[PDB]
């Protein structure tokens with residue numbers, strides 16, 4: 001928690017996970033599940049480098065990941081897809097349009113929510129520095145109300161860093177707090193998407209505690 | 220055109236009343252009748268919710284279709300935050316009505332009910348830990364009304380989404396103003412703004428899980444109902 005805002009941004013940029021590649025309608029769902037399964041491991045490695053995360057007990061680290069993992073997968077998809085209007089870039093070799101998501105019942109409703117988030121990011125010209133902060137807030141915030149001071153300390157630190165990023169970009173104080181608010185209000189829609197996404201996945205899948213624990217690779 | 224103080228005044232004057240459950244000293248409380256009472260209460264609350272929304276500055280500038288879509292997306296979240304607010308001064312309890320005050324042991328009678336009850340209690344506890352102020356509450360409720368449905372909506376649509384973000388920006392200015400007036404540094408102002416807006420994610424999560432629970436008993440106010448009221 002002693003890092004400067006610049007050191008925080010640099011830490012988070014450095015921790016970014018790699019973009020993974022993909023392995024008919026039937027094959028489409030299998031490719032998407034296999035991709036998500038392989039990304040999860042890299043998400044766990046990313047989480048361990050979010051300043052302050054590894055200060056939590058392993059139990060609490062797992063609970064946070066249980067709560068945030070689908071939200072983190074979607075905000076990364078939305079980020080990857082931001083410069084591909086009307087499409088979603090699941091992988092460099094798996095670019096899909098909404099028309100491909102019509103074969104499965106209830107798939108296109110989420111496809112559209114994801115596209116709308118990408119359009120919102122495009123409208124706001126979301127910067128990579130702001131995205132890695134938002135993704136860190138999702139990790140620390142999503143499970144906090146379902147288990148504390150340390151989590152809120154880290155969250156306050158990320159808030160400071162987001163403000164610092166905006167003042168550094170020349171925003172007035174008013175524009176700083178309006179942009180902060182706008183970014184955080186997107187997190188409510190990402191929670192909504194994650195909830196509707198879970199319902200859809202169950203309509204056809206949660207990582208177990210032991211699985212997340214093992215990937216954390218305790219020492 | 221409103222100032223921050225003017226925005227606070229409008230939102231405070233728009234606040235709906237606290238409604239009651241039925242009184243009958245000959246009728247002891249029973250858990251078999253609890254869901255009927257809560258449904259009756261929520262249905263009455265929805266009517267006042269419509270007339271509150273029409274007084275949230277900028278809300279009636281939208282088309283009726285988009286007013287309905289926003290209410291469709293936010294109505295349960297608004298009932299839930301109202302419940303949480305009413306319960307804030309009553310640890311361990313949910314104050315559905317002043318004469319309908321329940322603890323979690325009374326929320327175990329129905330499957331999946333205690334989980335949502337546990338979440339509502341935790342949000343109430345969070346409101347206390349922050350010493351959430353009434354002026355801040357009505358701003359948060361307004362943000363839910365304008366924000367919940369805006370990512371799920373043509374040239375008219377672009378104009379109304381622009382309007383909605385302009386009203387949301389003014390409520391942000393108002394929240395900050397209230398925090399500066401209370402004597403917080405800017406660091407504390409930014410940090411508190413963030414803490415408040417992050418609670419809205421949990422309120423959305425609760426709304427989703429509560430929808431699932433409502434459909435599990437077998438629910439939504441129809442478009443024509445909401446339109447007629449609006």
Ligand SMILES: C[C@@H]1CCCN1CCOc1ccc([C@@H]2c3ccc(O)cc3CC3(CC3)N2C(=O)c2ccccc2)cc1
Pocket residue numbers: 032033035036037039040073074076077090101106107108110111114197200201205206207208
């Ligand atoms: C990972 C867990 C652990 C235990 C087993 N689980 C495996 C199943 O969960 C998952 C998780 C995610 C997806 C994909 C996937 C993959 C990669 C990505 O970056 C993002 C996504 C996004 C996502 C929406 C959520 N999705 C879909 O298909 C989808 C997209 C659009 C509309 C409807 C649906 C598939 C399956």
Ligand SMILES: C[C@@H]1CCCN1CCOc1ccc([C@@H]2c3ccc(O)cc3CC3(CC3)N2C(=O)c2ccccc2)cc1
Pocket residue numbers: 257258260261262264265298299301302315326331332333335336339429432433438439440
């Ligand atoms: C309004 C719709 C439109 C068309 C018909 N109505 C349909 C009924 O939907 C409703 C809506 C809300 C509730 C209550 C109710 C009432 C008042 C309140 O202030 C708040 C709440 C909170 C709420 C959780 C959401 N709830 C429950 O019972 C509950 C609480 C705890 C755990 C599990 C369940 C009942 C029924």
